Design a binder for these strands. Structure first.
Ligand SMILES: O=P(O)(O)O[C@H]1[C@H](OP(=O)(O)O)[C@H](OP(=O)(O)O)[C@H](OP(=O)(O)O)[C@@H](OP(=O)(O)O)[C@H]1OP(=O)(O)O
Ligand SMILES: [Mg+2]
Lengths: 373, 111, 49, 222, 56, 34
RNA sequence: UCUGGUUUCUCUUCAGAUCGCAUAAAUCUUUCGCCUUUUACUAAAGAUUUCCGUGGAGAGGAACAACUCU
RNA sequence: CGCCGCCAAGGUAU
């Protein structure tokens, strides 16, 4: 997953379509690059690695658009989840004042989340076959296993839906189950992020109950997608959600003479060293560890710097992990500089992304998520 | 508080040092020491007041134009570091607010 | 490069620096890691030949 | 006129043994990370320095200028900082950590890290500085062709049933110094070459282009 | 001089590795020989055939 | 330059350089040697 | 059985190769820093030469040229 | 993380 993400800007704001054409030529020349433009006007580029983005910016600056270019400080694309189940049930409203869809949300297991991320189950299967697979894998209820519908982001991400927690027949007249409107609303509403404009993962949403209008051709049948949007991530953000940072799995080859330096540069950067393996052949041997991607900035450079040239490291994208802190923490004072070793760094990590293109702060459940009448 | 004037005093003080050095055609730190300068006229010499030996401050240059960061990374002043500790003039001049707070109570007790 | 020097009977084989001229870009001859490939169409004989 | 020379390997091994106490044990160009000529060109052009490296004068690109609203919308106390961006990150590659580059050179990355176990004892396959995790004397986990020693002598001609060589072993007295001289520095890995001059040849050349040894004064490092 | 003193060797003089200063003061005369060659040729011209007051 | 700063013109001003470190700072963890 | 040549000393132009596994000075045009005017200067870029050496090529000899590659 | 090291013409007339 291309996870590092830098903002890009021209020095002169006048000659903007020339760097647009150069950036498009880079995107043609570099396939794993993904460029985006947002409501705040600045262009952003997410790529795979540091030397990859190095060669990208080299060919962007001095071959395809020969203008001076300012960049921002690097940051990674981070994700969102919930860790416990819901403690309160949501509420719905529409401009027809007709529907009332109440629902909740609860987490999953990370192995089957990686399995559905790695195209193990597919939407082209039969209903009962993948129902029986999910049945024998996640010891689920039989009546609610086969009653699922289309999956989350690109029908692949672990954001599944289960309709049959609270009993199966309510109306079932015309729509009666999530078929076209709510499914496409979740397709169009899972990439644009709920909390701080970042995606969700490892959370499934289950409807408690719902009701359809008397005539969806006359009343709201296409006027319930932002309602479904608001109710889904209102029920998500009321369950005390958390953020997820990526780790890099790192493999280091190093001699035994300068060995403690990689341990000191991982323990300073919160490294959980897993495997110290003496390999046959070369006296240099391997260290397999986990490091945060936000602390991966110049990892191999400083690693070769402390080991005076003897060691070498490689980084790769690992799956998501839980950050030290919660986004909904209030009455807390965050210093602008002086990065925190403290266990409440996620509040800083989300206010410094809502000071970005973002939204407006004070995300408590008062205005857009619930109606305290 | 003004760092750019503390740099200017260090720049001009060593410049008049060098101007007196080229009058002797010496320009040497070891042959022509600063002991020649920092001695009073009553015992003999020229008699001058040190502001280069104040250990002028610096800051993070990336965030110096951005935000008041505090105090970090002291910079040396003059090229004299043999631990003689030539004092600064301002530590023997009474400040503004001390003079005003003393003046109010002095005139109050005088009345 | 070894198989293309088998192919080409016109060589400037390495004496001082390496002859990795398949890494063609200027940002991959100086790093020495390779950023952009370029595939080569050749012939190879077998033990029949 | 004393132009071109060709030596032999024991004679040059004696030269390599007599040329110690001023020659480095460095074999590859991996100790020179941020000590390369191109990294020093980058440090010259980018108004920065390596701790232990040179400090040049800047060039034509002294003063940058961006007005208040544009770099305000670009940079406030807004970026997610975890560790400060050091100057070694920019001297490594000045393209995503630093803006507006010119007169810049681009350095080397990851020569394949030769380790070169030295020898002080005969019997060249010494098997030292080398662990081994393979369980010896018993392993089978994959199928193999011909599990049946049944074929009798039919096609191996006895005039050349033997291997290629038995007239000499794979090691003798002057092969350890040869493979030690294979990974030797530049004046010793040749066996043949040209004649230089007494002002041409540098002697203090691999000393200063290193790291600074600890426990030394400030005048030796300047 | 700080690579003689490593180990039990001694602080006193004996620093007799002279090739390095020798090479750079050969590099001096290597570039200064045509310069003051031309200067002494101009000196011999100014001394032996006289000066040019209002020529060039 | 250890991290960010130094002096580009030591020959212009009447100084030699050598920015020190502020020993009067207060934070939790700063050492690397012990 | 025929084919039959390495060094050293003198001219002869071409050099595009870390011409040299290293690297001196000067001139001009600009930016600086000491500076009173200047030569002596500081140290960065741009472009020219000078200079200590080197590379391959045409000849005339001599040095064991007859040992012998072919 | 540690600048900097100085000669002369300018005056005892031609
Ligand atoms: O005074 P230091 O800064 O410590 O350096 C001195 C100095 O060398 P430098 O002044 O050039 O740096 C001496 O040379 P002098 O200038 O005093 O003549 C030299 O002696 P040599 O002339 O033999 O090179 C030797 O001093 P010493 O006499 O003790 O050998 C040396 O270093 P150390 O003083 O640290 O030994
Ligand atoms: Mg005059």
């Amino acid at each position: 997953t291309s996870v590092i993400k830098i903002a890009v800007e021209p020095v002169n704001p006048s000659e903007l379509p020339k760097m647009l054409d150069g950036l498009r030529k880079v995107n043609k020349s570099y396939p794993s690059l993904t460029t985006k433009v947002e409501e705040s006007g600045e262009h952003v580029i997410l790529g795979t690695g540091e030397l990859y983005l190095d060669c990208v910016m080299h060919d962007l600056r001095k071959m395809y658009s020969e203008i001076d270019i300012k960049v921002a400080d690097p940051v990674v694309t981070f994700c969102e989840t919930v860790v416990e189940t819901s403690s309160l049930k949501c509420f719905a409203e529409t401009p027809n004042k007709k529907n009332k869809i109440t629902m909740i949300a609860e987490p999953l297991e990370k192995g089957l989340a990686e399995d559905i991320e790695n195209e193990v189950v597919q939407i082209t299967w039969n209903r009962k076959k993948l129902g029986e697979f999910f049945q024998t894998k996640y010891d689920w209820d039989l009546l609610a296993a086969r009653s699922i519908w289309a999956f989350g982001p690109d029908a692949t991400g672990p954001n599944i839906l289960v309709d049959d927690t609270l009993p199966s027949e309510v109306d079932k007249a015309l729509l009666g189950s999530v078929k076209d409107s709510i499914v496409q609303g979740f397709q169009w509403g899972t990439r644009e992020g709920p909390l701080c404009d970042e995606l969700i993962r490892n959370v499934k949403f289950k409807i408690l109950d719902a009701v359809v209008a008397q005539e969806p051709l006359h009343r709201g049948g296409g006027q319930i997608i932002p309602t479904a949007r608001r109710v889904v991530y209102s029920a998500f953000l009321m369950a005390t959600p958390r953020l997820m940072e990526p780790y890099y799995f790192v493999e280091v080859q190093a001699p035994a003479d300068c060995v403690s330096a990689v341990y000191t540069v991982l323990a300073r950067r919160r490294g959980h060293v897993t495997q110290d393996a003496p390999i046959p052949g070369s006296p240099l041997y391997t260290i397999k560890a986990f490091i945060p991607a936000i602390d991966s900035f110049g990892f191999e450079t400083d690693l070769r710097t402390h080991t005076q040239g003897q060691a070498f490291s490689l980084s790769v994208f690992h799956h998501w992990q839980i950050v030290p802190g919660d986004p909904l923490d209030k009455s807390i004072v965050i210093r602008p500089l002086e990065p925190q070793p403290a266990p409440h760094l996620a509040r800083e990590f989300m206010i410094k992304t809502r000071r970005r293109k973002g939204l407006s702060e004070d995300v408590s459940i008062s205005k857009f998520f619930d109606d305290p009448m | 508080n003004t760092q750019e004037l503390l740099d200017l005093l260090v720049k001009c003080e060593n410049k008049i040092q060098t101007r007196i050095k080229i009058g002797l055609n010496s320009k040497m730190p070891s042959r022509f020491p600063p002991v020649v300068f920092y001695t009073p006229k009553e015992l003999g010499g020229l008699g001058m007041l040190s502001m280069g030996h104040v250990l002028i401050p610096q800051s993070d240059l990336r965030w110096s134009k951005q935000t008041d960061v505090g105090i970090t990374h002291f910079r040396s002043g003059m090229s004299h570091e043999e631990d003689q500790l030539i004092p600064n003039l301002y530590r023997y001049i009474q400040p503004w607010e001390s003079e005003f707070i003393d003046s109010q109570r002095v005139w109050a007790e005088y009345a | 490069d070894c198989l293309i020097e088998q192919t080409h009977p016109e060589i400037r084989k390495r004496y001082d620096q390496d002859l990795c001229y398949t890494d063609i870009l200027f940002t991959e001859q100086e790093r020495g890691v390779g950023i952009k490939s370029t595939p080569v169409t050749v012939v190879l004989p077998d033990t029949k030949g | 006129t004393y132009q071109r020379w060709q030596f032999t390997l024991p004679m040059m091994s004696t030269l390599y043994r007599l040329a110690n106490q001023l020659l480095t044990d460095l074999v590859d160009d991996n100790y020179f990370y941020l000590f390369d000529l191109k990294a020093f060109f980058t440090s010259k052009a980018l108004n920065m320095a390596i701790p232990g490296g040179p400090k040049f004068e800047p060039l034509v690109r002294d003063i940058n200028l961006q007005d208040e609203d544009w770099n305000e919308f670009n940079d406030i106390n807004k970026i997610i900082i975890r560790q400060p961006i050091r100057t070694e990150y920019k001297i490594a590659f000045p393209y995503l950590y630093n803006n507006l580059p010119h007169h810049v050179h681009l350095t080397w990355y990851h020569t394949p890290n030769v380790v070169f176990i030295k020898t002080e004892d005969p019997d060249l396959p010494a098997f030292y500085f080398d662990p081994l995790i393979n369980p010896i004397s018993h392993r089978h986990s994959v199928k193999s062709q011909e599990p049946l020693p049944d074929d009798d002598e039919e096609f191996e001609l006895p005039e050349f049933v033997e291997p290629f060589l038995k007239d000499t072993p794979l090691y003798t007295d002057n092969t350890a110094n040869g493979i030690a001289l294979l990974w030797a520095p530049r004046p010793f890995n040749l066996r043949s070459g040209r004649t230089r001059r007494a002002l041409d040849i540098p002697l203090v050349k691999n000393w200063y282009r290193e790291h600074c040894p600890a426990g030394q004064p400030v005048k030796v490092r300047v | 001089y700080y690579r003689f003193n490593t180990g039990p060797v001694g602080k006193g003089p004996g620093c007799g590795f002279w090739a390095a200063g020798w090479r750079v003061w050969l590099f001096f005369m290597r570039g200064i020989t045509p310069l003051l060659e031309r200067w002494l040729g101009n000196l011999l011209a100014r001394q032996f055939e006289g000066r040019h007051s209002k020529g060039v | 330059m250890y991290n960010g700063i130094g002096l580009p013109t030591p020959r212009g001003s009447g100084t030699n350089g050598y920015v020190q470190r502020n020993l009067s700072l207060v934070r939790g963890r700063r050492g690397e040697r012990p």
